[PDB]
Structure formats: C-alpha cells, structure tokens
Amino acid sequence: MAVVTMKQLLDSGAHFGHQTRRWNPKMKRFIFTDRNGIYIIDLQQTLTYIDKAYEFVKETVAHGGTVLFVGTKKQAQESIAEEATRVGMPYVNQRWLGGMLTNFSTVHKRLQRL
RNA sequence: GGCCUGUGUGCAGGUGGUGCAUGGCUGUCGUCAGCUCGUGUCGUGAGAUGUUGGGUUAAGUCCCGCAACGAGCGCAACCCUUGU
Ligand SMILES: [Mg+2]
Ligand SMILES: [Mg+2]
Ligand SMILES: [Mg+2]
Ligand SMILES: [Mg+2]
Ligand SMILES: [Mg+2]
Ligand SMILES: [Mg+2]
Ligand SMILES: [Mg+2]
Ligand SMILES: [Mg+2]
Ligand SMILES: [Mg+2]
Ligand SMILES: [Mg+2]
Ligand SMILES: [Mg+2]
Ligand SMILES: [Mg+2]
C-alpha cells in the first residue's frame, strides 16, 4: 500500500542517481540503467521498500514509540524542521551533535541547563 | 603542696652527623598560556579525537566545520593605587 502515485514520483524526479564519477558499486542491485553519466534507481524496488517501511512505522506508532528526525543538508533543513514541528516530534537539521542519545547523561545536564 | 640545698633514680642536655628519609618554606623555567578529566567514539594496542584546520587575539579570546559533547585548572575580571 502506497500513498504516492507513480506519475507524481516521476514528476518529482526522485529516480535519479549521482553521476558515473562517484557512484557506489554496492548500489548496483538498485540502479537500473545509466543515461548520460547519471543513474536511475529501480522504482518497483523503491515502492516495495517504501511499503515495508510503511508497515514498520505503522507498527512503531501502534505500540507508541518516539521517532527522531535528522537531516542536515542545506536544501531540506527548512522542510524537515517544518514537518517535525507540525508532527510535534523532536528533530535536528542544522548540525549533528556527537552521540547525543548514546552519551545521554551529559546531554541530560545540558537539557536541564536549557 | 609551692622551694631549693645534697644522694640518687627514670631523665634533661647536643649549632653532632644525616635536606638522596622526611614537613613546611623557597629559586628557576615563566606571569611563559598552556595544562587535565567525565562520557563517548577510532585502533585491539601503546594510545588518539577532542586541544584539530580557516579566521582573530596579549592569551585554549571568540566564530566557523569537523567524533566529538561537556567539565576542571589557567587566562580575562572580581583586589590596591593612579588619572576626573
Ligand atoms: Mg648540649
Ligand atoms: Mg643529637
Ligand atoms: Mg643537605
Ligand atoms: Mg610550561
Ligand atoms: Mg568498538
Ligand atoms: Mg584527542
Ligand atoms: Mg588531536
Ligand atoms: Mg574543538
Ligand atoms: Mg589542546
Ligand atoms: Mg591560542
Ligand atoms: Mg578556557
Ligand atoms: Mg582573569
């Protein structure tokens, strides 16, 4: 089950890979074909994986787990920040901090100070 | 009991040695700005990061990105004097 249509996917252009100069060989099983130095990902595998992620996230919300949203690239900072704020869910989009969750005791005092 | 004159007794007395056993105190590097730790992470391991690189400063002063995030001792200032 998906909520995003194929035509919308192609219009968005999420099927493009990086150029042939920096492509990861491990993504051979996903990249479909090359066309002018650029790669294309297998859309059907994309929908299948999206479906699996959808079921997992549904299970997560079902048993009540908190999800952390992380993204630091310049382009998507505002998008992820707005989406996380609307969902009311912690996030970060400016700069990743060293082991904030792993070393949680130190950040605990930082939160109390805040 | 306070006292001291004599016999003692335990005992006082030593600038006598030993600053390569020691306390305390002190000179220097140098009033130079650097010096450590908690958590985590890389390696296995000595260890490293953090403290780096760009910029800036009298200074580890501050910003930038980074497996680093913070904390401690330093520095700045809090003392005195001088200048209205
Ligand atoms: Mg004597
Ligand atoms: Mg003697
Ligand atoms: Mg001596
Ligand atoms: Mg020194
Ligand atoms: Mg390990
Ligand atoms: Mg280090
Ligand atoms: Mg280093
Ligand atoms: Mg640093
Ligand atoms: Mg240092
Ligand atoms: Mg410096
Ligand atoms: Mg400091
Ligand atoms: Mg000071």
A35 C-alpha to ligand 9 centroid (Å): 50
How far is CA A87 from each of CA A68, A75, A79, A80, A95, rounded to the nearest angstrom?
A: 11, 20, 12, 10, 21
A15 CA → B64 C1’, Å: 35
Resolution, angstroms, 1 dp: 2.5
Task: Give dist(CA A62, CA A68) in Å, integer.
Answer: 16
Neighbouring-strand partners of residue A16: A40
DSSP A75: T
Residue A40 DSSP SS3 = strand
Provide the H-helix boundaries in A1-114.
6-12, 43-63, 77-87, 104-113
Q: Which residue is nearest to nucleotide B68 (CA to C1')?
A: A98
Please name the method used to determine this structure: cryo-EM
Write the Ramachandran bin of A75: left for phi over 0, alpha for psi from -120 to 50, otherwise beta: alpha
